[PDB]
Amino acid sequence: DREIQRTLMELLNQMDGFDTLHRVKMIMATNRPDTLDPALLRP
Amino acid sequence: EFLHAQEEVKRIQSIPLVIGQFLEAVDQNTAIVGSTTGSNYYVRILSTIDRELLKPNASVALHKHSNALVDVLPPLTSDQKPDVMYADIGGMDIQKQEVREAVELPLTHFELYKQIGIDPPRGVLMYGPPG
Amino acid sequence: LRPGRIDRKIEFPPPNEEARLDILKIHSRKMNLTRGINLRKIAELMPGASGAEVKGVCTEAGMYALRERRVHVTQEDFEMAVAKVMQKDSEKNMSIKKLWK
Amino acid sequence: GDLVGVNKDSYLILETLPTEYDSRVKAMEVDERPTEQYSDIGGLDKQIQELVEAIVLPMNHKEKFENLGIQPP
Amino acid sequence: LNAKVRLLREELQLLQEQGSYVGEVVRAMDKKKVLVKVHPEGKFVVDVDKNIDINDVTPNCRVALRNDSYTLHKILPNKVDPLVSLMMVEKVPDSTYEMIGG
Amino acid sequence: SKLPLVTPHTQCRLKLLKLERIKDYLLMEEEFIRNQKQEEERSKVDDLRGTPMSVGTLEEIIDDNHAIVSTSVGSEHYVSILSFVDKDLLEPGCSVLLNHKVHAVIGVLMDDTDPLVTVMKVEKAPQETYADIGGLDNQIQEIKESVELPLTHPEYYEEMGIKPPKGVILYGPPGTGKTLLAKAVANQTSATFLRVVGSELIQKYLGDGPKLVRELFRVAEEHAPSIVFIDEIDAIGTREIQRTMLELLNQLDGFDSRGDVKVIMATNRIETLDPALIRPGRIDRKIEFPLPDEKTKKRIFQIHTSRMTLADDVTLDDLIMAKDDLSGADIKAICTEAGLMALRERRMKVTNEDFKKSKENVLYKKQEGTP
């Protein structure tokens, strides 16, 4: 349960590392968006 | 002969050397170091090493075989680095001045304001509509 | 507090005039003060301080010095500081003299 | 993501291995092949037919489904 | 010059010797045998060398060993570094009665 | 071992004489010790186990002299056992010495893990005694018949055919002397004493409650004659906490044979406890600790103020009187508070007025109700 939060932190850091130039885009799909951490919800 | 001997001393700390972390010194000729292999060892210090560099967490280099401490290596968390500048802000000049006095000068020059003796600034409040 | 348990109690009422004198002196000991200061008027002007807010008044006088880039404090600086330290003027009609009068 | 047997010291690859998932996963495999007959089941004939048509028929033929174009359940 | 040369030579000869590990003793179990725990090698029983002063060797001594056969070498300084308590403990604080007023 | 007991307490020549006799004997021990083979067995065994020897954990024994052993690196090894290792001292989980080179099993290391109950083993019971507790005569007899006499003299019960009582509950107002009596009975019979106070067995993890109960009773069995004192049984006793109750109840009267361990539990609120916890088949002795009466209160005052220097004027009876509203703990608080009052006035020798003020203040430390 710990490793999942520590990994979400790394996902957040790698996501925020997106410079404007990369031709890289991302899709996330879920059936229970309420359970999703509000950290991701931030613009 | 002394030139030969000193050349050998220099030859001791040549590559490859295993990096580790410095624990507190024991005596003038020895100290305890924890190699990056994970293990800890009680190791002779090479007498050429300048002692002042031996901070209790410094990164050091040890002989690969004997683990001999032979070199001292010369030494952010996230996107917490904001990467945005006052040039990017849309002209909030009054707020720019207020915040810059409130935090920026305390971050840069808190030692003078400690010389004032005031426990230099600790907290500011920002209020207004969102966005 | 039952007798076999913890044995004693000590009361800490808000600092009085003499206590305000001490605390102001102690927290001003490090600050660059100026002749012509009258700290006793300042202590008299702050009725019912809790002690911590006197550390606050020293802090605010120093902040007034600092935001003006002055490394010294004067009587006026402390006097406008105390105004910021009032903060109990936010009582007003609500419950000031009604209900919980 | 392959499984290769390499030299114990020089670490050169000198064998290609069948992938191994896990011991528990192999324990999940049926080797005894139990024996309870369909006749031993009573009253469940409709449920039996549903399960059979859903599972066995795709294994048996695949022609009756593909002739219709449906995805078998 | 000769003294310096001799110094360097003996230094190199000692530099050939390995790192002798670091361990902490859990229980002395009579002369010539003492138990010590070392990083993840684990807990080993070891015969003490000629210095033999075992009653000096308290538990948790941070004692040094031999790199081979682990033979006890010397007691080393103690491991204090009480950061486990120091996250919370205030040690001996600075607060003193003269800064207390009233 | 410890020094004997010196039981004059007033500073008198008798005390000095007893201390002098202790001094003399200890000096003779000094003299004796200061005033000063098996090499074949050594060269055989202590050289087969050539130093250094590692420490690992025995997992299983497969043959008469072959065992499976793990080490701190987590590896697993099938290795023979040399003949001198005591087989019956070897079991799964046992810490075992191993030859460094070929991992040979060369002796069991006496256990130094399971630290929780390891510190839980009190061994510091000798602070109290039946003498130190006064006035609990009927309760003393009850506890003696229940837990003590079966341990000291099981002979009567084996001759009679009785399976002796092996679980007791103590109840009453706090400060009446329940924990005191528990520690005193722990002292009178030198069977080892284990304490675990109520809510401290309650734990956040799903396991540690019942697991803690299990290892507590396991260590109690291992020490064999032992006392398990469950203080504040209330917190657990009044699904998970009920499961901890279930494990404790099963360990009290369940499968297997429990053996010699005695169990004494203490509560303030007996009427609130779950009837299952008070198993009338298991909890066969319920002992009330009521508030001390006049004779008792006199005894408690005497024992607690005995070690005190006293003036002439103290009217001890008038100190007692009242309407028996104070337990023994309140009396000890009275003693300490009177001592403080005497010290304030500089009296190293307490007086009656000290006790009067002490009792008045302590009684003022009661109640809050206006009407």
Next chain:
Amino acid sequence: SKMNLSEEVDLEDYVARPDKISGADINSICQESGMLAVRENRYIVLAKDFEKAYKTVIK
């Protein structure tokens, strides 16, 4: 400024208009107008793009 925009963009209209929109709303309007411009494949942002972005957002 970092965007392209056309010569006919009338910023003063949105400066004077009553809606009490925030700076975050400014950024949202500008990004959305650029997105409308990209939607029509037009490489430059027109006044109609700002119009549609302004009315598309806020209240």
Next chain:
Amino acid sequence: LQSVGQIVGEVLKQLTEEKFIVKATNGPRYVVGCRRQLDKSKLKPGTRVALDMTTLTIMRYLPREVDPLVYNMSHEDPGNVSYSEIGGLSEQIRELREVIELPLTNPELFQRVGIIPPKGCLLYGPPGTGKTLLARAVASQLDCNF
């Protein structure tokens, strides 16, 4: 058969033009030197390099790890699903193609317009409405690395 494997490891600070700090994958931290001839400028913190497992000297800076988990996470069959197989999601397909396809297919639009393209999209809904299908279609139609 005469050949011997070299030890892989990530590199760190270049102490000098010759002494470098490599970090063997799940291993210790060393200070080592490049062999003789390899470039030194490209040896920057974050370049996978092979190490001779006798002197640990740097040789053969490798491009970067693929981590076969990721290889499986790319070379996976998404199906032949086209947009004409998803139905009733036309507005949502428009949004997804506008946020994920167009910024990739036509980055020069976002270059000239100067808009920072949205980084990613979140698909949410009840189970079995087409989110995974949407992703499958985007994978099967856009000729890229998925």
Next chain:
Amino acid sequence: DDIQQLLKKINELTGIKESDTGLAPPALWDLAADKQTLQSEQPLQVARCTKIINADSEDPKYIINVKQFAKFVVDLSDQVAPTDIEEGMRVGVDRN
């Protein structure tokens, strides 16, 4: 006070109380058999067996999963037989 200090002195003079390991009654044990067996046999490591390759039922080539150490492709000694070993089986394995 002198009682206390000289009690520490007694503790120091008598030294640390001996800690044992368990060497049974002396008459029970040893014989040359113990040392001979120690120097002659092999302290085997323990492994899980896995994926009996059985590429020809002639060179079986079983995989092993020695825990916390490694996994190897290995063969039987001249003593054990193919019918003895199965997949899993928690086999024992020589150390070199």
